[PDB]
Amino acid sequence: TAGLDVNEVLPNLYAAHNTDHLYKGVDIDGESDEGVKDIREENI
Amino acid sequence: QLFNNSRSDTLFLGGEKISGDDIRNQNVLATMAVANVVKSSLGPVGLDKMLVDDIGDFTVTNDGATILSLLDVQHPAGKILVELAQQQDREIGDGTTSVVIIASELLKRANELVKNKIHPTTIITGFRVALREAIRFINEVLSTSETLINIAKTSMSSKIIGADSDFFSNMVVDALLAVKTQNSKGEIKYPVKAVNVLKAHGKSATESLLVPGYALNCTVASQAMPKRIAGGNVKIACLDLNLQKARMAMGVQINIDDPEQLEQIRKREAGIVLERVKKIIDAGAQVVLTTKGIDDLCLKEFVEAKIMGVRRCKKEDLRRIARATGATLVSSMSNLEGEETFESSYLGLCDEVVQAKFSDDECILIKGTSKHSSSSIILRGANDYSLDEMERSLHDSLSVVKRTLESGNVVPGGGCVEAALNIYLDNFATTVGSREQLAIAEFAAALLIIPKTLAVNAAKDSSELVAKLRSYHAASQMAKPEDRSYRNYGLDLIRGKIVDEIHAGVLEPTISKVKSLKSALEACVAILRIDTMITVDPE
């Protein structure tokens, strides 16, 4: 829905999730086009 | 867009009229209609369509003009772009899809200047200026040139055989490079479709085998004839007259008055033929190729003489076998004196005449021509829909190679001829000034459609590449003489990054971009000049 590389986000999202790993979930925008965001800090 | 009312003053029959703004719009809408169908089909990342006959019978293709040919177009200003689409395929061979999408945006933008306030005469003068400057710029950004293997391969991608581009690359190049011919005392052009293309459904796509001779789609007329003749110096009789029994010439009638003449006259209807058959066999002919008929009467003469002899073969084929083996086409043989003689020097020398079995179908191959190289391509693949298109994809790719060989100039394609023209013309806009400025300005940006849709078709974002491409082309106008060292150009779409398309090998022919725009203009010019349409109903 955000228009990001499905094939480049999912591997970058799994990799960062293998205890600070527990918080990591996908985010929107160009800097986060790199990948994810620490969901514990955005109040999400 | 409310359906307009017929005037209460004017009186026109089986015909109504839409004026000024209503027409201008209807033209642009119908022009976009035609163009937008075939935008999806543009670029290496572009795709193909499936066009149902209505009976279910269909054709799958990319080649724009064939897609446009096929769509039933109803609007005048649609069929105009379709008439141009093919005018492309008869003057360049490729680029048919591009030329249509350019013309559309030229209209579309031109209109949005009139739909503002700017007069059409201003814009049409402002398109004249840009084009005079774009072609002058193209010739100053052309590269005169191994290289043919690219120009082929650039017209491979965007079409089915682009996945096996390298093979169907060296196919195309050698096939053409082996039919060189001079005309009009020095014109060295490579014949517009001399490479006879056949397609048979079998084997693999890679196993499509080029013929080092010529492919005839005919068989040895009689089954008792040899289906092969091999070894050096084989003699071929290229015929044109039929070998059958004649009705009394033309204005000739028969009045038998002496019964004994029944059999006399009837038997002599055999002779004339058997005598012309003999004057062919006895000339030293081993293989006969006749455009018109062979009688069962004249087959039994070839059979027993071991002469592999074909009947009813396309004269289009036979003349290109005449020019290649050494043979001369025999329309009919009558000497200096009235006598009907046939000298042995009439025949063509080759290597082999072998009838080769391809996927449930035999056809005759004239191998190893002596008088001049000859080349033919026999395609192989999945089904008829498969083959059909890769023949059309070849005709497009053999074409771009021809125009390279005909004209000593190539352009760095990949949409960098277009992208460079965007900023050059946009900067040229100030040289004139006034209202004529927005015109060239809209034209300069109306060229964006090629580099734009190429990257749209990749599904991912466009603007990332598109605007960052412009900067690199805006890095050639602020670039100094020595400091060239800044000059580079091109676009890649599989990896999706800006690449040097000369080093990458992306090459479109010179004319393919001149006769591309030249036409595209005289299209939208005519449409923009339209201010009233008057449609009159059938007889």
């Binding site: - | 089986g14 015909g15 059938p538």
Partner: protein
Amino acid sequence: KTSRGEIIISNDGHTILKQMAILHPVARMLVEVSAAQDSEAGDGTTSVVILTGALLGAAERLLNKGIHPTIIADSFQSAAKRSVDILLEMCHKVSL
């Protein structure tokens, strides 16, 4: 677009009028005038029609003002005679 089907794009006025489907007999007379201008000049087929449309508009106002058309017609043709005379005197000749 022709009754027959052919597409025609033009600026030549006689070519425009001949190919639209004018129905009103008096309106068709206009095509004839535009044809006659082509067969006397080849140019001015547009000029000649507009003039009839503004001359007729003229005639209209005069009929509004109650002038017998016979007088209008003859004095309009008296307007021709004096005008073509002017063009003949005002024109600058050309070395052939």
